[PDB]
Amino acid sequence: LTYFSARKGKRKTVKAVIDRFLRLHCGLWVRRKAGYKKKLWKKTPARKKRLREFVFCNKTQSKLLDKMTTSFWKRRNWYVDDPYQKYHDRTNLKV
Amino acid sequence: KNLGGKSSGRRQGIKKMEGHYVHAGNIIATQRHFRWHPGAHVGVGKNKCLYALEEGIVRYTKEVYVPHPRNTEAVDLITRLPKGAVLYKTFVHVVPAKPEGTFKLVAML
Amino acid sequence: RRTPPLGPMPNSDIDLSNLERLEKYRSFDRYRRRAEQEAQAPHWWRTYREYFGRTQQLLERKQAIQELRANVEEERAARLRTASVPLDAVRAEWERTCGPYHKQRLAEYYGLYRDLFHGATFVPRVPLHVAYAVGEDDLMPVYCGNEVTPTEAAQAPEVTYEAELWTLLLTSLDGHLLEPDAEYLHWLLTNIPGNRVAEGQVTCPYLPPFPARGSGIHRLAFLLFKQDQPIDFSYQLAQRTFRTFDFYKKHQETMTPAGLSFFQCRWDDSVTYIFHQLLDMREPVFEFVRPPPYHPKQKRFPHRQPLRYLDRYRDSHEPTYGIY
Amino acid sequence: KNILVRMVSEAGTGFCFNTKRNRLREKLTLLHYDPVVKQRVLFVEKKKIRSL
Amino acid sequence: YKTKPTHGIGKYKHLIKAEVRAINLGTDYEYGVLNIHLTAYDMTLAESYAQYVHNLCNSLSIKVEESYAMPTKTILTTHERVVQISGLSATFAEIFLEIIQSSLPEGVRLSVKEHT
RNA sequence: GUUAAUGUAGCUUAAAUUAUCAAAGCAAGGCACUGAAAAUGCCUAGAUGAGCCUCACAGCUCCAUUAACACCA
RNA sequence: ACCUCGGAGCAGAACCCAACCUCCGAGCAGUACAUGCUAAGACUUCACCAGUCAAAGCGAACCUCAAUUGAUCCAAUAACUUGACCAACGGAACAAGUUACCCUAGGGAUAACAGCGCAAUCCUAUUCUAGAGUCCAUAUCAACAAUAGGGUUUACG
RNA sequence: CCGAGCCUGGUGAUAGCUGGUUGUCCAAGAUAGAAUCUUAGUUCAACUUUAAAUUUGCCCACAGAACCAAAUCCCCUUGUAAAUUUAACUGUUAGUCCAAAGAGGAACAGCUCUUUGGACACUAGGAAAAAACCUUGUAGAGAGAGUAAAAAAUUUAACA
RNA sequence: ACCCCUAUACCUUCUGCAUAAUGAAUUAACUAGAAAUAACUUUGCAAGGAGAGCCAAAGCUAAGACCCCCGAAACCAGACGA
Ligand SMILES: [Mg+2]
Ligand SMILES: [Mg+2]
Ligand SMILES: [Mg+2]
Ligand SMILES: [Mg+2]
Ligand SMILES: [Mg+2]
Ligand SMILES: [Mg+2]
Ligand SMILES: [Mg+2]
Ligand SMILES: [Mg+2]
Ligand SMILES: [Mg+2]
Ligand SMILES: [Mg+2]
Ligand SMILES: [Mg+2]
Ligand SMILES: [Mg+2]
Ligand SMILES: [Mg+2]
Ligand SMILES: [Mg+2]
Ligand SMILES: [Mg+2]
Ligand SMILES: [Mg+2]
Ligand SMILES: [Mg+2]
Ligand SMILES: [Mg+2]
Ligand SMILES: [Mg+2]
C-alpha cells in the first residue's frame, strides 16, 4: 500500500479491501465465500448452503487487512438499522 | 509414459480412538471403504464417515454382521458360507454418558 | 508383531479344506438364526454386551389334542383360514398355568424386585384380581402394568382373589417427593381372613395415588402376602414413607409374598384434589429440564465459522449499548 | 448432449430453477416446489441456458 | 488390528471357493462328470423324472453341475433331458445306480453316457 | 452460442392448391452380344408432432442441417 | 515428454511422505425434481482459497458413481441465474521467432576442457575343463561361467 | 570504444543479482510443507524469539485401531516442568554425510530421491591428517585427581 | 632472543574453504538502518480523554522504541558534433 501519500503524507487504504470485507468493531473481518454465485447448477444443496454464508477470517488475515485500512474503518458506527449491529461487541470471551 | 498419480493423502482414519470423550456430531473415523461399521449412537454420512450421535465414550467392538436382505450383494455372500460360519465386523459405539434430562422443581402451585 | 488369540477364534472348528462338500446356508433366515445365537454366547473379546448391559399331564393333553383334531368342522375352519379362538378361555387358562411366570418377568422388566426387595425375586402364584370401580356400571381392572388414572383410583378397589390369613399392601414405588429410596404406601390391609377383604385390619387407610404434574409415570404395586400367624404392627407424609425391604425383613419368618398387580399413574385433575383438599399443602410441579447444549471454547478469531457463531455465546438477544 | 434449461413456475410466479435434460426429448414439465407459495406447483420450461 | 489377538476375526474369503477326468488315484476312486440321458415322448414323464434323480442326488450330497436338455426330434417328439453327475464312491456306485433303475416310471430309458 | 434460410421419388431440379421430368433401377424390342435411342410402367409419409379451415399449400410445434454472426481484455 | 484431478504400489500396521518412479483412470453419464429451507458438533489433502459430513428443527413424503473440475474482476439478464482445453488447470492477455554483431548482472548452485568419484564399457590375471589342436583339456588357442586387479577408452556423476 | 554517437537532464533509473554493512558483554536460537511465468524470489504454514494469560504438557498400561516386518496411534499411573492460548514481529524456506527401510541407476558413484534417527554447520578428546564415525556437551582460575573413546590380526599344499 | 611443545591468516560465500574460491600493499581521513497504523513500556486524566476536527462498551492523550550503502547494460527529452 501507500504508507505515505504524496499530497497529504498519510496512509492510503487499499480500496480492494473495502469492497470485499466488513470489519466488526470487536476486530473480526467478515467475508463472503468465493464462488458463491459461480456454477450453482453442478453443486449439491449442502454445498450451495455453505457458500451463502458470511464467514470470519483468520488471525493473520485479520491483521493483514487491519494494516491495509486506516483508522476510519476501525471506529464505532451507530447506524440506524444495521443488521450487523449486534455483532460489533464481543460478549463472554475467556480470551 | 506413467503420468498422473500425484494425488495427496486423504487424511482418513480414526479421529477419536477408544475411550475418548466425544460430543454429538464429532466425526469419529473417516474411511474410504467400510473398514469400521457404525454401532450404537453412531451414524454414517454419504461418504461413509462415522459421526457420533450422542455425547459419550467411544468403544470399538466385534459383532456379527447380518446385512440387510435388500443388500443383494452381501446376502449372496451370506448364502455361500458353510453352515457354521459367522461373519464379524468391527463396530464403533458411543456409550452415552449423560442422561437425557432430569425432573427439576419449577414452582409450588 | 502378532499376538496369539486368547480363546478359540470363530469359524475355526468348522474350517475345512473342502468347501464344496460342506453344506451351506442357502438362505438368509438360516444364517440369521445362527447369527442371533452367536451374539448371545459370551466371547473373549469386547462386544456390545459388555458396555450396554407330569405323566398324567401329558396323557390328558395328548388325548385332548387328538379329539380337537378329530372334528371335521375344526379341520374345515382351520384349512379355510376362517377359524377363530375365543380369548376368554385362553385368558383364564393362562393365569392358572404359566401366568405366574409371565407376571414374574413383567415385574423384572418394570423394576419391581430391584425396588421392592433389592433384587430378590419371587413368583406370583396366587392370581389376584384388583379392580377399581368407576361410576356404577363398569369397573377398571388392574393387571400387571396397566394404566389407571387417579380419577379411577379415588376410592379403594374391589380386591377379589381365589385362595384360602393374608396381608395386602400398596406402595407407590417412586411417588416420594423427598427421598430417592423410600416409597409412600397407600393402604395396608393385614390379617385378611380368607377371601373377604373388608374384614381386614386397616392400619393404613386408603390414600389415592398422587403423582405430581410433569414428573413422569409412576408405578404402584399390590403386594399380596401369604401369612400364617397374625402380628400386631407399628395424612402426614412422614408417616406414609417406608421401604418395603426392611419392612418385609421384619416379617419374612412368618409371611411370604404371593401375588403381584402393579399399574401406572399419570397426573390428572384429581391430583389437584388430593394435594390441596385432603393433604393440605401446595402441590409441586416438576418439568423435564434438558442439560444445556455443548458449545466449545469461544475463540478470538473463529476462522471459517458462519456469522451466527457469535450468537451461540450471548445470552440476551436485546441490543446493549455499554457506556453510551 | 445435455441442455441446462430454466423452469419458471406457472403459479407463485417469478421463481425459476435450473435443471438438466437431453437435447432429444420434448419440453420438461415438472412438479417442483415453490418456496413462495409453499406448495408443489407445476413448472414449465421457458428458456435454455447452456448446451452442455 | 494386526498386533491384537482379534486379528483376522472378520476374514471370510477362505470360506468361499470363488473362481475333468476319471479320478481313481490310489484308493479314493471316483468318476468324472457323468451325464444321465432320459428320453421319453411325454414332456410330463421326462420333466418329472428329471426332478427325482436331482432330488435323489441332493439327498446324498452328489454334485450336480448341469441339468439341461437337448431338443426334440419330430418322429411325435422325443423329449430328452441330461442330468450331470460328478463323484461316486465304490460303495455308492452300485447303490446310486440301482435306485434310479428301481424307479423308472413307464418306458423311459436311462443313460450313463459321458461328456462331449 | 445467437439471427437467418433450408428440408423430396434411388437422387436432384421444378411446379405457387392439384404434384410435373431428367437421371436411377424393372423388364421386354432392335443387334452375334453389350452400351445408346426409343416405346412403356414405377419410384414422392411433400423432414414433421397436432388440425382453425383442407393443406408442398401455413403459422405455432419441431429434429437434423446451411450461411452470416464465434463481441469484449 | 510433461504441467489439473482421482485409484493402487513404493509408503506392510494412526496420519503424512518424493521421484522425467511403477501401473490404472477422470474432464462424464444416469435417475430424481422437497437435488426445499434451516441449524448443534466436527473433518480437512499438511497454509490460505476452497473442499467434506451432520443430529435436532421447519416443511413435505410415508441421489448413484473414486475423480467427473476453474477464483476474482460487475457487468450480459427484469430477476433467478449463466459464461473459459483461463488444460501453463491458484488462472496475466489475446504478445512469436532470432542473435556467430551481441550486451549486462551473476553462477563452479550449472555444462564443455582438466582433476576427482565410479568401473557399466574396456584391458588384464587366475579358477573351471566344454571344445578346437590326427589321437591328446592345459605346446598353443579357448565357450558358458566364476573370483580378483588396473584406471588407457566410451560413459555416468 | 557505433547492432546505433556524444553530452546534459529525467536520475539517488531499476536490479529477486554480486559486493559491502563500523562499540562492549550476556541470553534464547537449525531443515514438516503448500501455492507461485515459480523453484537464485516471495506469501502462508512449520520452526524460532519476546511479552502476557491460564492449565495442563512430555513420559505413558490395561483395553482398543480391516478386510482384500521394526514400530506407530491412543493412553491413566509414574517420573517430571513444562505446554496451550493471547499479543507483537523478524529470520530460516539453494543442506551435507552416517546407520536403517526402500525407489531410480550397474544390488556404480563423495550419485539422485523419500522416510525414521543421529551428527554437522558449536566446544573438546580420539580414528595419523580429518564438517558428518566414536567419546563428550553449559562455559572462569589451578604447576590437583579419577576417567571416557582410544594401538589390526594373519603364513598356508610330501606321500604309499 | 631462538632451539623444545602446541597451533591449517582474516573477511565474504557456502552442504562444506588452510583452501590452489572472493576481496585486501599499508597508513591517515572519509564511507552504510531514514518510517507507518497496531501492539508494548511509562506518565497524565478518566466514562470520558484531547488546546475545536478525532477516538471511546477503560478508554484517551503525550513520550520512548523497528525498517541501509555501492554497482548495470538500458530507455526517453533537449542540445552539441561531418
Ligand atoms: Mg498415490
Ligand atoms: Mg504428494
Ligand atoms: Mg487443514
Ligand atoms: Mg433430519
Ligand atoms: Mg502458470
Ligand atoms: Mg499452476
Ligand atoms: Mg558469419
Ligand atoms: Mg569431466
Ligand atoms: Mg540501486
Ligand atoms: Mg546459548
Ligand atoms: Mg529469482
Ligand atoms: Mg496423557
Ligand atoms: Mg549427495
Ligand atoms: Mg563442566
Ligand atoms: Mg577444514
Ligand atoms: Mg585466497
Ligand atoms: Mg562471489
Ligand atoms: Mg588481488
Ligand atoms: Mg570535410
Side-chain angles (χ1 to χ4, degrees), chain A, chain B, chain C residues 1-53 64 70 77-324, chain D, chain E residues 1-74 76-116:
Chain A
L1 72 157
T2 295
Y3 298 93
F4 296 91
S5 80
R7 283 274 176 104
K8 290 295 268 215
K10 318 173 169 176
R11 281 173 87 103
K12 305 217 183 195
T13 85
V14 191
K15 276 288 158 68
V17 172
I18 293 313
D19 295 87
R20 269 75 172 264
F21 301 97
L22 159 79
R23 174 176 162 88
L24 316 173
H25 199 276
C26 59
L28 295 180
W29 291 81
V30 162
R31 55 175 193 86
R32 295 218 82 159
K33 279 191 74 71
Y36 82 100
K37 49 173 69 172
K38 292 296 293 158
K39 307 160 155 59
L40 289 167
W41 63 272
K42 67 165 73 193
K43 303 184 151 70
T44 55
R47 180 186 185 180
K48 279 150 71 167
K49 200 254 184 183
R50 285 194 275 275
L51 296 166
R52 297 191 260 97
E53 280 189 345
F54 311 127
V55 294
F56 301 104
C57 297
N58 221 321
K59 182 212 165 182
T60 50
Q61 298 170 340
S62 297
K63 290 325 182 315
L64 178 129
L65 304 161
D66 275 8
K67 296 157 170 322
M68 267 161 153
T69 54
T70 46
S71 41
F72 175 80
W73 307 91
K74 311 174 178 73
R75 70 183 305 267
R76 306 291 301 197
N77 288 321
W78 296 108
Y79 299 142
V80 184
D81 263 350
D82 212 10
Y84 318 101
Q85 182 54 248
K86 60 176 153 187
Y87 298 126
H88 280 193
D89 55 350
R90 201 75 182 271
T91 61
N92 230 7
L93 274 172
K94 310 298 154 30
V95 186
Chain B
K1 186 91 201 143
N2 281 307
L3 61 98
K6 301 168 200 195
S7 178
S8 293
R10 282 86 57 88
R11 276 88 173 161
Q12 285 169 335
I14 282 170
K15 316 278 142 69
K16 301 275 192 318
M17 284 274 177
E18 176 78 17
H20 270 191
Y21 197 81
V22 158
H23 312 271
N26 280 105
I27 302 186
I28 284 170
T30 320
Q31 64 212 6
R32 157 80 190 195
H33 290 111
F34 266 115
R35 170 168 184 188
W36 311 278
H37 294 68
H41 315 294
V42 161
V44 180
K46 311 173 137 68
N47 64 339
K48 276 169 273 293
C49 84
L50 301 185
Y51 61 98
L53 290 159
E54 314 285 332
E55 202 159 301
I57 286 174
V58 181
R59 304 290 176 185
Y60 288 81
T61 66
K62 313 273 194 323
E63 279 92 357
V64 177
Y65 189 62
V66 192
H68 206 275
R70 314 175 314 191
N71 183 24
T72 77
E73 177 272 351
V75 171
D76 292 3
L77 186 144
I78 280 307
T79 67
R80 294 176 186 252
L81 294 179
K83 190 70 182 298
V86 175
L87 297 200
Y88 280 85
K89 303 285 164 162
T90 302
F91 293 158
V92 196
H93 319 281
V94 165
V95 178
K98 304 283 201 291
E100 45 270 58
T102 71
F103 297 103
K104 270 194 173 177
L105 189 143
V106 177
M108 308 286 287
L109 266 157
Chain C
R1 178 166 87 261
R2 296 266 200 274
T3 301
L6 318 174
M9 286 293 274
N11 325 317
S12 67
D13 287 302
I14 68 145
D15 192 3
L16 271 305
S17 39
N18 67 86
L19 290 180
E20 185 95 22
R21 285 171 273 216
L22 267 173
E23 286 183 292
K24 303 169 158 35
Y25 312 116
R26 277 93 67 188
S27 56
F28 181 78
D29 261 353
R30 276 198 190 89
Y31 170 76
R32 193 191 169 183
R33 290 189 202 186
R34 177 87 250 188
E36 290 177 303
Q37 182 215 334
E38 185 83 7
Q40 305 299 310
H43 304 305
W44 54 272
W45 56 83
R46 317 269 74 78
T47 170
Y48 168 86
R49 180 144 289 185
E50 305 195 352
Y51 313 100
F52 295 89
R79 180 189 328 112
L80 271 292
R81 69 194 57 183
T82 76
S84 317
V85 183
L87 299 146
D88 301 62
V90 191
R91 178 59 188 245
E93 288 290 327
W94 170 75
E95 51 90 9
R96 213 186 62 223
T97 46
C98 46
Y101 292 109
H102 290 192
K103 267 181 181 189
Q104 194 202 321
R105 62 155 89 111
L106 274 159
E108 297 257 32
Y109 164 66
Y110 272 90
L112 264 71
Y113 304 145
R114 83 202 190 198
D115 288 87
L116 286 169
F117 305 124
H118 283 49
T121 181
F122 72 98
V123 183
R125 299 278 181 185
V126 192
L128 93 168
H129 311 266
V130 192
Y132 279 94
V134 280
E136 203 208 330
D137 281 335
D138 47 287
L139 75 168
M140 182 80 203
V142 187
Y143 308 116
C144 46
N146 216 29
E147 175 77 26
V148 186
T149 58
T151 80
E152 301 170 356
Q155 204 60 267
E158 294 182 354
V159 180
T160 315
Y161 64 103
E162 202 164 22
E164 212 277 325
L165 273 188
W166 308 87
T167 86
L168 192 146
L169 165 61
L170 202 164
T171 51
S172 198
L173 281 146
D174 42 2
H176 212 304
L177 310 180
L178 183 53
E179 293 146 277
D181 310 67
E183 62 265 10
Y184 295 154
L185 83 159
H186 287 272
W187 70 325
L188 202 150
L189 292 211
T190 179
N191 296 329
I192 289 173
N195 263 27
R196 274 138 293 275
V197 194
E199 307 204 341
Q201 297 188 334
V202 44
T203 163
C204 274
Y206 181 69
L207 255 181
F210 49 109
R213 189 163 99 236
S215 88
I217 304 193
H218 291 46
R219 58 215 205 280
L220 302 101
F222 284 85
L223 290 190
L224 170 69
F225 281 99
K226 182 48 137 56
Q227 204 200 25
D228 292 357
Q229 302 88 41
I231 300 97
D232 198 296
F233 294 151
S234 278
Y235 271 154
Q236 296 300 106
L237 285 187
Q239 310 178 24
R240 300 289 195 141
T241 166
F242 75 106
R243 332 188 164 192
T244 305
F245 169 58
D246 42 2
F247 161 80
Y248 171 75
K249 198 206 297 192
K250 305 309 144 213
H251 312 268
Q252 51 163 326
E253 314 95 5
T254 83
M255 172 200 74
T256 44
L260 275 170
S261 279
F262 56 97
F263 65 104
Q264 306 269 305
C265 261
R266 304 185 169 237
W267 158 269
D268 223 339
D269 45 28
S270 90
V271 197
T272 320
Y273 186 72
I274 297 154
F275 272 120
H276 288 329
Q277 296 308 316
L278 58 97
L279 188 58
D280 298 307
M281 73 165 197
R282 286 205 304 276
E283 60 168 13
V285 179
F286 306 97
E287 278 216 350
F288 193 82
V289 168
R290 313 190 176 269
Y294 167 67
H295 291 304
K297 188 184 158 178
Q298 192 181 358
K299 292 177 277 186
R300 278 285 275 261
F301 293 97
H303 161 65
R304 273 172 84 86
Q305 287 301 134
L307 197 46
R308 58 186 194 265
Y309 180 88
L310 302 188
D311 301 334
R312 320 168 177 155
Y313 301 98
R314 70 185 56 196
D315 50 276
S316 45
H317 274 77
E318 285 171 348
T320 169
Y321 289 87
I323 63 167
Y324 300 105
Chain D
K1 186 198 168 35
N2 284 350
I3 304 301
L4 197 151
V5 294
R6 100 168 72 247
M7 315 263 301
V8 196
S9 47
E10 291 272 327
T13 59
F15 187 80
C16 318
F17 85 106
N18 305 352
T19 182
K20 308 162 55 181
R21 71 146 213 256
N22 299 66
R23 312 181 44 192
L24 272 303
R25 307 191 211 233
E26 64 268 36
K27 300 314 201 81
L28 265 184
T29 304
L30 281 183
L31 264 174
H32 203 47
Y33 160 78
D34 259 346
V36 175
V37 154
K38 311 174 175 181
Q39 291 174 14
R40 282 196 212 140
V41 297
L42 279 183
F43 280 65
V44 176
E45 174 199 302
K46 276 279 288 183
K47 217 183 192 179
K48 64 147 304 191
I49 310 181
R50 167 148 83 102
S51 46
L52 67 98
Chain E
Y1 198 54
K2 281 177 172 181
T3 73
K4 296 275 135 179
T6 40
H7 181 50
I9 195 165
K11 53 171 57 182
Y12 55 88
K13 292 291 284 186
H14 58 93
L15 315 161
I16 285 183
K17 204 177 211 154
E19 171 90 37
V20 53
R21 259 169 280 139
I23 310 299
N24 293 40
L25 266 293
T27 51
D28 206 276
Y29 302 157
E30 77 169 26
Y31 278 148
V33 69
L34 263 47
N35 299 58
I36 298 187
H37 306 75
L38 312 166
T39 71
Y41 291 89
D42 261 348
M43 197 67 111
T44 76
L45 204 47
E47 285 206 338
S48 87
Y49 201 53
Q51 304 195 164
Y52 174 69
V53 52
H54 208 300
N55 298 139
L56 185 45
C57 279
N58 186 40
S59 44
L60 291 163
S61 161
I62 322 170
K63 278 65 204 172
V64 179
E65 297 93 331
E66 299 199 21
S67 283
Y68 76 119
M70 265 283 185
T72 47
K73 312 176 290 226
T74 170
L76 312 165
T77 62
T78 166
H79 325 272
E80 39 176 333
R81 272 91 175 93
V82 182
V83 177
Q84 265 204 14
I85 311 301
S86 73
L88 281 302
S89 70
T91 42
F92 276 15
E94 309 95 342
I95 305 198
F96 166 72
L97 276 159
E98 66 180 292
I99 311 302
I100 321 171
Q101 172 264 2
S102 188
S103 75
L104 261 174
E106 280 181 351
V108 186
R109 42 212 195 101
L110 269 165
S111 277
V112 186
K113 315 272 154 295
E114 308 204 51
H115 66 315
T116 317

